[PDB]
Amino acid sequence: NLNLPEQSTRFQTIASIHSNNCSFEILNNDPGYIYGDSVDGECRIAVAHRELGNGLERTGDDRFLFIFYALDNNNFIIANRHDGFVLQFLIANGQGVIVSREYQPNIHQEFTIQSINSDTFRLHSRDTNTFATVCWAQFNSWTKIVSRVDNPGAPNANLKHRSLLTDINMPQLPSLTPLQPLPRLTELEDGGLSPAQAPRAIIGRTLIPCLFVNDPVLRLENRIKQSPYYVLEHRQYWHRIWTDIFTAGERREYREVTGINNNAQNDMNKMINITIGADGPNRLRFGNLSTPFRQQIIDNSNTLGSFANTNYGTRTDIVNVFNSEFHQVRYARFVKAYEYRLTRADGSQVGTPWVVLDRKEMDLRTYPHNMAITLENVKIDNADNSYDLSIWKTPLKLKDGKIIIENHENSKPYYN
Amino acid sequence: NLNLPEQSTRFQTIASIHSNNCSFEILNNDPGYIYGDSVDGECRIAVAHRELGNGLERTGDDRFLFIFYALDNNNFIIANRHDGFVLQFLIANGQGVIVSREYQPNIHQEFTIQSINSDTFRLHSRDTNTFATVCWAQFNSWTKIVSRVDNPGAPNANLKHRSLLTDINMPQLPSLTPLQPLPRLTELEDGGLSPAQAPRAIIGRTLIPCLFVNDPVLRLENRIKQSPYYVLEHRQYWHRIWTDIFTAGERREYREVTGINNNAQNDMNKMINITIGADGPNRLRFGNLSTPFRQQIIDNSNTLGSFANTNYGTRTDIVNVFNSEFHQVRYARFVKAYEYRLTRADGSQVGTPWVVLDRKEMDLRTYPHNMAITLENVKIDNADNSYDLSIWKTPLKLKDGKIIIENHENSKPYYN
């Protein structure tokens, strides 16, 4: 169920319909570079670093191959397979040219496809109202790619795709799976499933353009070839925070650390330009790089947009629990975990997943079955921010198998 | 699984956290209107039509109730339940105020939620960098709602929701179903399923804000109460274009009308500010009203954005077919239909569905089974536009049960 335009799931060349054999070619040229075949004037000399050429198409050559990354606003970022730089409109010496530059992004890297008919289109830069074509209509000559306004004299700007590459290492997306309740404990010695062992539900997954994935091992020129999209998974599991055998009437104290640490948020921001907002464990904040794709990322990952100006942090609660049963009882206490995992197209993990422990959704397993522990008291030891300072109303009975979610009736501000 | 913020699936009041009993109130006042409780100066006199009041909240009064419609860019359009008008920033007499106006839309109708903590937020107008609050911090007085820049001694702009309405007539969305192949024919008398009888697959469905649904029966003040969202369904079915018994070696001619009528496109544009682009039967063109929601509409309806400057039209093909079997054979010919249906929250249909017949995807049923008809020749009789003038390469064998899709190998321009 992949809802992308065909230009976004392949590489393609770009050519004037009036050119026999030439296509748009990525150059590493400098100002003063001579286009030998061109008539004299503005079409003969490069005015900018990394102009595009009207080159005889070489089959299999990455310098002619482009992928169109689809923005939420229906425009495209157009990246080349040779080095992963993107097309950009630029004025140098009063001449409108197409260059290749690193993804910024900026409005001059956004292109509009204007389809004239089934196989013919124009590449529109909407900010300048210009269309990409060959300098002075020299359609069969070595010269630069320009971007010009429509006038009577203007070179025809009708383009086509000359060649396609359809084998591009698209990822295989995992199937959605529901979050199951944890099994019952089987004996006193059963501590339940540890976080490493707990099954993950796949709640959502989205493609991420490789352009702003700071993969610590793959540089951009290799990402665009091997993993033009990455996969971000939204997973959930039941995370055990502690387990112990209690004697009849035994009282114990635990330090419960929930949320997500500052170092994990900084790693997530560096890697994909996204953080978890303080307003919830499924609430995403977007930076400048990820913002143009935010609605697709939210829709496909089954998260929500964050409205917070602060990131989710850690909180340490001191919890006092009392075994109010006259039996020896195994207690195992779990909170819901949100796990964000990034993989390459080959399925390889890019680093350690980012995990938010949600203190507001909690479950209990006991042996024997159907035992209940008393939550005597909760106190905040410390928190990284003041966004969520609610605590459980105590005393509270936690029963085997019963999920408790925070609401107006079972919680209060810490100072009441 | 509805992926919307909680503010988008309920109505809520808006209040200063520093007000005992007052909330934002929709007024139908004129310039010169006197706020009796206000101290003298800019807070006492209305400067614009339809200012907002700081009114003692009346429970169940629609003049205090707002729904937040979520834009693709993570901002909101805020509509009131009394008349369906939306909040807007306005400068009149050098004073920044909040007014209510008809959905346009414009950038001054876009509000950003800035969540400070769990139950406190600010309403940000990002173009002007202003925040909504009560004039001169008169939090317990009858006066107007202003929108001011943050300065030392600016009125505190921390807000809350005082009251909620959660029973709002949200639609119950249909389940997605797959498109099944048509059954085999059972005898010579079996003409197969007519278009009225063919089962529909539900390929996608999306919520549409009532603000730009030109319901022919329900005015805006009634839509916002009864159907704050409408449902747009993307359905598919197999549409029978003809069926006949052929004698051995019999030749016949059919006029096949495909695409969508201009009158149906105009009706769709008037109703929801969307048309089907000429680049495909699932390709949507958005006007000024629907554009701010386009990525949500595409993602949820499982359609694609159109790149065409032309709407899908009708085309009439003359097809010559030949029964190349030495048997009497029942032939039934089908094309794929795309059916777009709009319903209110109560499930009632707003108009006749909009149907695109796709000439490029075709199936055949025969009796007896496993028979093949010859497509001798295809000619275009007329078309509404020149966007797609491809025809089948003939002769072409159409086989019982075999779906044929247009590609580069089996089609050509009509003039070749």
Numbering used by the authors:
A (entry chain A), B (entry chain B): 49 to 464
Verbatim from the authors:
To do so, pH 11 buffer was injected into the vacuum chamber of the SPB/SFX beamline, allowing mixing with the natural Tpp49Aa1 crystals prior to data collection. In total, 707,992 diffraction patterns were collected from which 426,506 could be indexed in space group P212121, (a ~ 80.12; b ~ 83.22; c ~ 156.49 Å; α = β = γ = 90, highlighting an increase in unit-cell dimensions in comparison to the pH 7 dataset). Manual building and refinement from the ensembled diffraction data led to a model with Rwork/Rfree of 0.177/0.199 at 1.75 Å resolution. The pH 7 and pH 11 structures align closely, displaying an all-atom RMSD of 0.487 Å. As in the Tpp1Aa2/Tpp2Aa2 structure, an increase in pH from 7 to 11 is estimated to alter the net charge of Tpp49Aa1 from −6.518 to −47.822 e, suggesting that alkalinity will destabilize the crystal by negative electrostatic repulsion. Overall, the binding energy of all eight crystal contacts (excluding the dimer interface) increases by 1.8 kcal mol−1, indicating a weaker affinity. Despite this, the binding energy of the dimer interface decreases (pH 7 = −11.1, pH 11 = −11.9 kcal mol−1), indicating an increase in affinity. This may suggest that, during dissolution, contacts between individual dimers dissociate prior to the dimers themselves. The most notable changes include loss of hydrogen bonds Asn51[ND2]-Asn350[OD1] and Asn51[ND2]-Asp347[O] of both monomers at the dimer interface. Given the proximity of these interactions to the cleavage site (Phe48) of the N-terminal propeptide, we hypothesize that loss of these hydrogen bonds would increase accessibility of the propeptide to proteases.
